Each structure stands twice: as C-alpha cells, then as structure tokens.
C-alpha cells in the first residue's frame with residue numbers, strides 16, 4: 001500500500017525501475033527545497049528519494065515494529081537509510097528554472113560542508129566534487145526538468161539529467177568516491193539537514209513495509 005506523492009504538480013510514482021541498473025525502487029518520501037528570502041520561502045525544486053526494494057529486508061532487523069514517531073527521532077534510523085547496503089535513487093525536479101551551475105553550487109556547498117564536518121574531505125573528495133560540478137556545467141533545468149542521483153552502495157554516485165521527469169537511459173557521469181557518494185543524500189535526510197519533510201515521509205511510510 002505504498003502510494004505516490006505529488007509536489008507542486010510534480011508527481012513521484014510509487015515505484016520505478018532503472019534502465020541503467022535494472023533494479024526497482026519504492027518511493028521513500030518526497031518534499032521541496034528552495035530559498036528563504038526576507039522570511040519568505042521561495043520554492044525552486046522538488047525532491048523524491050527512492051529506496052531499492054531490498055532495503056526493506058535490510059532495515060527490517062533493527063527498525064521493524066518501531067512507530068513513525070519513534071523513527072523520526074532516531075538518528076541511527078536515518079544513518080541506516082543513508083549508508084545502508086542497497087541503492088538509493090534521488091530525483092530532483094525543478095519548479096523554477098535553474099541552470100546546471102546555479103543548481104549545483106548550493107548542493108556542492110552543502111556536500112563540502114558535510115565532508116569537512118566529518119573529517120573526510122581530502123584531495124580525492126575535492127577532485128570528485130570538481131568532477132561533480134563539471135557534469136552540471138553543460139545542463140539547464142527548465143521547470144519539470146530533473147536530475148537523478150543514483151547512490152550505489154559500492155561507493156559510486158551516478159548522475160543523470162532529464163528534460164522532464166522520466167529516467168534517462170544512460171548516465172551522464174560516475175563520481176567514484178565513497179565519502180562523496182553519500183554526501184548528497186546526507187544533506188537531505190542526514191542529521192544536519194534542517195528541512196524535515198523528507199525525514200517525516202520516511203518515518204511515516206516505512207513502518208507499514210517493515211512489518212510485511
């Protein structure tokens with residue numbers, strides 16, 4: 001009984017299947033990001049986080065039988081989702097048009113702050129973030145356009161870009177670095193991520209699946 005979610009008219013199917021891996025994922029949660037200007041929240045993108053179907057078996061052990069309220073306050077729960085032994089797929093869709101460099105600037109900012117924060121930001125990670133940036137330079141995201149982050153548990157982050165919301169057939173780049181590979185999702189549902197809309201969805205939707 002996993003539902004779909006719509007954010008500012010951008011729909012996120014309950015399940016999807018990757019053309020690059022052949023795996024299927026279920027929608028863990030959706031939300032929105034933007035900027036607060038003069039006390040006003042200005043929407044720019046929508047975000048949906050998908051978890052590989054096998055994530056349920058992996059998470060069942062420690063989190064089955066926990067209440068949504070209980071999960072929402074347990075940081076360890078989100079750590080297992082971020083670093084769990086399964087693929088995660090994040091789809092960011094634009095509400096307002098942003099060029100590749102415009103969108104990526106803030107994302108890289110947050111990723112770099114996190115990496116430096118946990119003491120894992122050396123030359124390799126800096127070079128990986130440079131490659132990350134490079135991948136976005138030739139892209140533009142008009143309303144409805146999407147970016148796909150495929151977090152592989154093998155320490156690789158795959159980047160895809162779509163003119164709309166459909167999953168690209170091929171990936172535009174592969175960032176091969178363990179620390180950086182989870183940085184993006186970290187800044188969305190990790191401990192130091194202020195917006196809690198995504199964390200709440202995860203806390204609310206997982207319990208049902210973890211039981212069956």
Ligand SMILES: O=C1C[C@@H](c2ccc(O)cc2)Oc2cc(O)ccc21
Nearest residue numbers: 033034044045102103106107110187
């Ligand atoms: O989905 C987004 C939007 C993006 C953004 C919004 C407005 C803007 O002007 C530039 C970038 O910031 C982010 C930063 C992150 O760590 C993770 C996700 C996002």
